[PDB]
Write a structure and sequence with these properties.
2 copies of one chain form a homodimer. With about 550 residues, chain A is an alpha/beta fold. Chain A has 2 domains: about 5-240, Rossmann fold, CATH 3.40.50.12390; about 255-405, no CATH class. Helices cover about 45% and strands about 10% of the residues of chain A. The first copy, chain A, has 18 helices and 13 strands. Chain A has helices at about 5-10, 35-45, 55-75, 90-115, 135-155, 175-190, 205-215, 235-250, 260-275, 295-305, 320-330, 330-345, 350-360, 365-385, 425-430, 445-450, 475-485, 495-500, and strands at about 20, 30-35, 80-85, 165-170, 200, 220-225, 230-235, 310-315, 315, 465, 470, 505-510, 535-540. Chain A is globular. At the A-B interface, helix 1, helix 8, helix 10 and helix 12 of A face helix 8, helix 13 and helix 14 of B. The complex binds adenosine-3'-5'-diphosphate, chloride ion and magnesium ion (2 copies). One magnesium ion binds near residues 175, 207 and 279 of chain B. Chain A: It comes from Homo sapiens (Human). Chain A: Belongs to the 5'-3' exonuclease family. Chain A: GO terms for molecular function: 5'-3' RNA exonuclease activity; G-quadruplex DNA binding; G-quadruplex RNA binding; RNA binding; telomerase RNA binding. Chain A: One of its GO terms (cellular component) is dendrite.
Chain lengths: ~550, ~550
């Protein structure tokens, strides 16, 4: 099984995506691995099975196997970068909240079902997959196991001894993807960067593909096992860049500025964002997804000549250009409306606008503001990909995108972001967790989620509608923080310790190093007698570039 | 521009369809040309100008020019097959009527508007495009000229020498494209047929794409000039399309119980294509060509294929159990569309009931009526598949409603018995009477005209001077005029057939495809079909064979 964006790409460009056995995998210099997928798979693979239980020792053992096998098979010759999600920008936090609410509700529903058929549950509580959020006790124990694992491998396995290993764990702010991109940019910025560096990124997900392309690195490949643990899906972005080039070649006869594959790829990326539902979803009945891309490509080819240049200029949205592209693309909405208007017969404008109005209600200045926020959202996402986070606090305050036909008068819109700063882990926990998960928090905060008189009780509804789109309130930053103030100094010692940001590690084997690395859990794993790891700690701001 | 379905596949498969200059057109063995679009283009290019007039010799000159240019540029090495539409199966009768009725209505509206502005029109009659129908005086004249043109070319132009020319004109029954397909099948039947034959089919229309694929020929391409007549051309290689589809569906390779076979997948792909509507069957409600509809069909196909014991379209024979399963799944489309606009089931039924009463003017929308709708639909799908794969299997069958059923009503069809009788093509005057409005009656022999005008004519109800047109839309107009019962038409006609004039009797018949070639030992005077306007061929070098009507028909 493969993700939708992957397959669609595959099908659009035959000859492109490959399936290859172990021995036919090429040589690679750098391997990037976002761990969150692995942690989920190793901790809760059988969510259908209300009876399934797994102990931490088994989780960690399993996480270890994944790293060992992936490393053994990809054999990165220069760099291995392991990332675990740290605290995310607010813009990502609404989606994180959604998933966590959905997840708790779905597991409680399944439990209730099992009970209704008179089944008897295990007595020990379930693994609450919502514990896979930066700053929880589970993530802290995991973090210690991963560090240990790296030290162990460095100290025992020759194949881990000639490589620079980076570990960016849950205390280092940013989603693992964003962290990987940040490291890729700093590498590109180093004066001797070899443009033929061979990168391998583990995964097939839409955001990974976009990440690999946004890098603009010549040789970038995504990889994943075919059968879920041997053959592997292998996607070469160098070929994909070539397929894209050939597809867009016709513009060489049409545009009066330089056709540049790198610039075309940037606009291709922007169009992929316009149809993505993985950030701001479109209304389900508009069928705006991957299948709409050919229409967006079509419209791009047609209009690019009148534009005078590209739309996504290395992450900077050209607003006049963008407005014209949208205006043209906006026909799509009436095409869809017309299927509905037909049924009504058994003036179009009055009917189309009252079609739109009816959806919005699920004011005139509401349109413009929603329009403006949407454009801001696009710029925010573009920044995230090309430049890194430009606002930790900004978010898109609606559950759905506006109708494209409603995005206009945006060409001189003023888009100013404040960088702000990441939440402390516990602020993050309260901003992403449902009351059903309250046990993941320190005691001193738990009542904010449960108690009828809590000042922010409305952010933790036990029941809510779902369309996935989870219909729950948007947290007001000031109210969340204000409410926590009164509780913060009731935090235990180990808890104040978890409530901190912490740095990325750079690690490598050294012939001239020996010390004792203590087991994170003595009963399950040995201490490292003779640990040969040399480390450099990377300062938090080290790879951040200012616009 | 290009047709919608072409545009669609161009967008779905982006490295499929090039625009090429003349000098880059590959070599072709066989060129197939259906002529009707050309004839319409040369006879009435400017319908918004109510003043435009054009003499027949001019129309013929321009047709000759179009043909000469396409032949020069494509230069088929082995075969050129030119077809004009002959009488069509009655399956097409409603749509042929629809176009001709609207054409006369639209012409009259333009004239009325010109006169409202105080314009004065030429006193000579405009060209009635309804005359482009088998067996008219205009089509018989044109036919004479096209035979003359073939002979002239063969006799004078070396690139027309050493190639076999076929001309299947308006007196040979069948739509041009399907006479072309019959030819292609007769070629494949031969022991020495070369699988590497390079075929070129002129045009970009959806039926042409489908026929190309239905041929299962390895190298078949479509071509049409980018701008109508340094010139550029759309070129679609079906070899490439086949590969693309092979990929789109290879995911199935592991999921299925039975042998994965690209040929069988193409069959099913072509079947799905029929669901968006054609000349023969109205489209399913809410299912038009665009981005979502089609992948939905194809996505559903991906999803459900594993569950079946095999393919749905088995070489042109519909597998009814499998087709049902498929439609049933696809129907989820209907509820989603409706949920936009168990209480639900009740409201949906009343939604659907309204459509059936309002659009098909039926009285009682019962389960039995719904089962009847389902039966008509599936028999239509099977008629079309026969038509593409085996050749027409009933000359009389037709779809009897102007609108299709809801996809959600098409069920309970698994064990349906589908029976067709071959019958035979109408004589051209029988089609001509059927398909024309009273405003074009002067194209018919005088002896039949009262049938379409007289208040006591037994078939007067078929020729309403006024009618409604559903004009929603891109989209195709639905013309709401009655379906002809051929038994009543033919009985009314027998009151008049024996009154035909001698020249008219000569046009009311079927006649054969011609096969023509340069022969060095041949020399004779070929007469001008119009002495005052075109010269005799003093040294005609054409040798020829008349191909009997049944020569390429296969009993199923
Ligand atoms: N009014 C018109 N203008 C242009 N072409 C027309 C036309 N009516 C018919 N045609 C052409 O002639 C073909 C045969 O039409 P008919 O069957 O009514 O005689 C049509 O193919 P399609 O039926 O595939 O559109 C189309 O190519
Ligand atoms: Cl002869
Ligand atoms: Mg035809
Ligand atoms: Mg047809």
């Amino acid at each position: 099984g493969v993700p939708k964006f992957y397959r669609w790409i595959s099908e659009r460009y035959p000859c492109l995506s490959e399936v290859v056995k172990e021995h036919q995998i090429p040589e690679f210099d750098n391997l990037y691995l976002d761990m969150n997928g692995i942690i989920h798979q190793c901790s809760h693979p059988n969510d259908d099975d209300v009876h399934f239980r797994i102990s931490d020792d088994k989780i960690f053992t399993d996480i270890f196997h994944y790293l060992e096998v992936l490393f053994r098979i990809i054999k990165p010759r220069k760099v291995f970068f392991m990332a675990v999600d740290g605290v995310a920008p607010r813009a990502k936090m609404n989606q994180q909240r959604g998933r966590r609410f959905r997840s708790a509700k779905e597991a409680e529903d399944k439990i209730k079902k099992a009970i209704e058929k008179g089944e008897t549950l295990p007595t020990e509580a379930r693994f609450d997959s919502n514990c896979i959020t930066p700053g929880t006790e589970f993530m802290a124990r995991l973090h210690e196991h991963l560090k240990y694992f790296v030290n162990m491998k460095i100290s025992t396995d020759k194949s881990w001894q000639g490589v620079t290993i980076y570990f960016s764990g849950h205390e280092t702010p940013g989603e693992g993807e964003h962290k990987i991109m940040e490291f890729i940019r700093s590498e590109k910025a180093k004066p001797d960067h070899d443009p033929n560096t061979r990168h391998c990124l583990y995964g097939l997900d839409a955001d990974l593909i976009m990440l690999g392309l946004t890098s603009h690195e010549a040789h970038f490949s995504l990889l994943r096992e075919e059968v879920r643990f041997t053959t592997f899906h292998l996607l070469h972005l160098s070929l994909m860049r070539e397929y894209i080039d050939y597809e867009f070649s016709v513009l060489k006869e049409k545009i009066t500025f330089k056709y540049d594959i790198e610039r075309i790829i940037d606009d291709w990326i922007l169009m992929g964002f316009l149809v993505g539902n993985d950030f701001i979803p479109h209304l389900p009945h508009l069928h705006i997804n991957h299948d709409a891309l050919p229409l967006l490509y079509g419209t791009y080819v047609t209009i690019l000549p009148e534009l005078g240049g590209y739309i996504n200029e290395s992450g900077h949205l050209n607003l006049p250009r963008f407005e014209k592209y949208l205006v043209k693309l906006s026909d799509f909405d009436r095409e869809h409306f017309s299927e509905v208007f037909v049924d009504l017969k058994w003036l179009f404008e009055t009917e189309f606008r009252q079609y739109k109005r009816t959806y919005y209600m699920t004011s005139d200045d509401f349109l413009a503001d929603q329009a403006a926020c949407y454009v801001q959202a696009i710029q925010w996402i573009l920044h995230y990909y090309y430049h890194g986070v430009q606002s930790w606090s900004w978010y898109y305050p609606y559950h759905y995108a506006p109708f494209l036909s409603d995005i206009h008068n945006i060409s001189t819109l003023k888009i100013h972001f404040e960088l702000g700063k990441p939440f402390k882990p516990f602020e993050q926990l309260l901003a992403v967790l449902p009351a059903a998960s309250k046990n993941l928090l320190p005691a001193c905060y738990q009542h904010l989620m449960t108690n009828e008189d809590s000042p922010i009780i409305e952010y933790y509804p036990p029941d809510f509608k779902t369309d996935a789109v989870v219909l729950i309130p948007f947290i007001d930053e000031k109210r969340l923080l204000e409410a926590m103030e009164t509780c913060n100094h009731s935090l235990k010692k180990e808890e104040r310790k978890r409530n901190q940001h912490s740095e990325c590690l750079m690690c490598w084997y050294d012939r001239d190093t020996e010390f004792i690395y203590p087991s994170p859990w003595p009963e399950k794993f040995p201490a490292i007698e003779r640990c040969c790891t040399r480390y450099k700690i990377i300062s938090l701001d080290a790879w951040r570039v200012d616009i």
